[PDB]
Design a protein around this ligand. Structure first.
Ligand SMILES: Nc1ncnc2c1ncn2[C@@H]1O[C@H](C[C@@H](N)CC[C@H](N)C(=O)O)[C@@H](O)[C@H]1O
Ligand SMILES: [Zn+2]
Ligand SMILES: [Zn+2]
Ligand SMILES: [Zn+2]
Length: 468
């Protein structure tokens, strides 16, 4: 169907969850419930000269805008498509002679658009940008002060010839940005490169074990104009069967934390007490802090082990933050060794170490060791995550690659295939990441075939040498 259309959903009022979205029909895993273009989006301050301001792709050669020396693009093409939103901030930045906060730039794009369209409601919309939820009234002292400063900078940056908004509406737009931004990723889903506002997605509530997942698709342009699958957009996809009338939900955080831990994060960032089934029953918590059972550690050998792991981790962080990779590995091996007799492999402290060890070892190009930890982590992840979870998918793809690089083609291809299957649900066939994985699956198939033929030839050799 088409980007912007919300037919498959309708707004409705929840108990204490305020507004929510429900399916107007039946859905199956991988179905695109709806797509949506960003109402406004900006590049993070860190990455102003390394990411396209139109499409958010990383690239070795970008072309800066001769007029402001701020905006960068992949092509004159991405530069043209950006003009509509960039005209005003370009001319506005030259006048300010400084580049404002990323929040400030975003707030300005939102208001320039409200002005341009003389309204905050978009034609696709269930909600106008200014009616999104804003928890400003619960912002901490630092949060509030932070907002006063940006409003002031905003005022000096905001063109005098542009529609003047009241301070109340302005601080409100800032509140909305803090409680509604969607992080944007480069085309490889490697690093967060920007923040965007997607109104419709803004009506979907949270659940630690959601029935929907969201993906940002950078889009592509190579001949053949106006095509749904190549348009920059975010999509809300079904992770499984969703009945008509069922409320749609996504997860605001990563699932790999204790229910108490998740509630704390959700309460702090989204001012609410999560009441999903997983948090109320503490589902998976036993697995999250699983101890072994052949010997069965005492209640105290565990408490010491968790404390020790908590200790090792932060220590590993420091070292990693200083580029001391070998030290990081050393610390990981030692802790994993001590954990073996106590924790099972679904225990979050074990998994954390495996993921870290596997990452650094891969970076150090020690693929053989990395592939072992990578396999263990995937096996543990498989018992915790929803089988169509995007993080699980991305993690399996990575473990698959490390195994491939180490020469373990059988295990590599298998993992790559499992990842591809998951990504087809969470990212779709047209996503940049799904395409790179498909290309990888193709290469591993051929290498596996070459591996299997080599073996069958040794069998034909033994055959002939024996006369069957
Ligand atoms: N499971 C939940 N239980 C209670 N409140 C929630 C839940 N999930 C989201 N919310 C609330 O919804 C806010 C974010 C919105 N993007 C979601 C739709 C919102 N319910 C609305 O009326 O616009 C959060 O900051 C919470 O205040
Ligand atoms: Zn671009
Ligand atoms: Zn410019
Ligand atoms: Zn929950």
């Amino acid at each position: 169907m088409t980007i912007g259309s919300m037919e498959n959903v309708e707004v409705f009022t929840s108990e204490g969850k305020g507004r929510g979205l429900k399916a107007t029909k039946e859905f199956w895993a991988a179905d695109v419930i709806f797509a949506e273009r960003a109402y406004s989006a900006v590049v993070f301050d860190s990455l102003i000269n390394f990411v396209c301001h139109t499409c958010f792709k990383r690239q070795e050669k970008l072309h800066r805008c001769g007029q402001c020396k701020f905006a960068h693009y992949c092509d004159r093409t991405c530069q043209k498509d950006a003009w509509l939103n960039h005209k005003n901030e370009c001319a506005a930045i030259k006048k300010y002679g400084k580049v404002p906060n990323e929040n400030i730039r975003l707030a300005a794009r939102i208001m320039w658009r409200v002005e341009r369209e003389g309204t905050g409601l978009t034609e696709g919309c269930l909600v106008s940008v200014d009616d999104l939820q804003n928890h400003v009234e619960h912002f901490g002292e630092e949060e509030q002060k932070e907002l006063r400063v940006d409003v002031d900078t905003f005022l000096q940056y905001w063109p005098p010839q542009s529609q003047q908004f009241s301070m109340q509406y302005i601080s409100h737009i800032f509140g909305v940005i803090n409680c509604n931004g969607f992080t944007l990723s480069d085309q490889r889903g490697l690093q967060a490169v920007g923040v965007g506002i997607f109104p419709n997605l803004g009506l979907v509530n949270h659940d630690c074990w959601p029935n929907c997942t969201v993906i940002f698709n950078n889009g592509n342009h190579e001949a053949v104009k106006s095509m749904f699958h190549t348009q920059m957009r975010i999509e809300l996809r079904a992770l499984g069967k969703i009945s008509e009338g069922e409320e749609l939900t996504v997860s605001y955080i990563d699932f790999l934390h204790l229910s108490e831990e998740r509630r704390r994060q959700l309460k702090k960032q989204y001012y609410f007490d999560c009441s999903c089934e997983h948090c109320q029953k503490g589902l998976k918590d036993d697995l999250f802090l699983a101890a072994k059972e052949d010997p069965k550690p005492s209640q105290e050998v565990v408490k010491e082990m968790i404390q020790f792991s908590k200790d090792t981790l932060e220590k590993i962080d420091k070292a990693r933050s200083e580029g001391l990779y070998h030290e990081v590995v050393k610390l990981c091996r030692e802790c994993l060794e001590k954990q073996e007799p106590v924790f099972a492999d679904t225990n979050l402290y074990v998994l954390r170490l495996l993921s870290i060890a596997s990452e650094v070892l891969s970076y150090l190009q020690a693929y053989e060791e990395a592939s072992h930890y990578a396999r263990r982590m995937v096996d543990g992840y498989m018992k915790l995550y929803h089988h169509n979870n995007a993080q699980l998918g991305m993690a399996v793809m990575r473990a698959g690659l490390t195994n491939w690089h180490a020469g373990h083609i059988e295990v590599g291809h298998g993992m790559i295939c499992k990842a591809y299957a998951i990504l087809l649900v969470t990212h779709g066939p047209s996503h940049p990441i799904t395409k790179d994985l498909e290309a990888m699956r193709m290469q591993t198939e051929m290498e596996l075939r070459m591996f299997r033929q080599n073996e069958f030839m040794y069998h034909k050799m033994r055959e002939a040498a024996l006369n069957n």
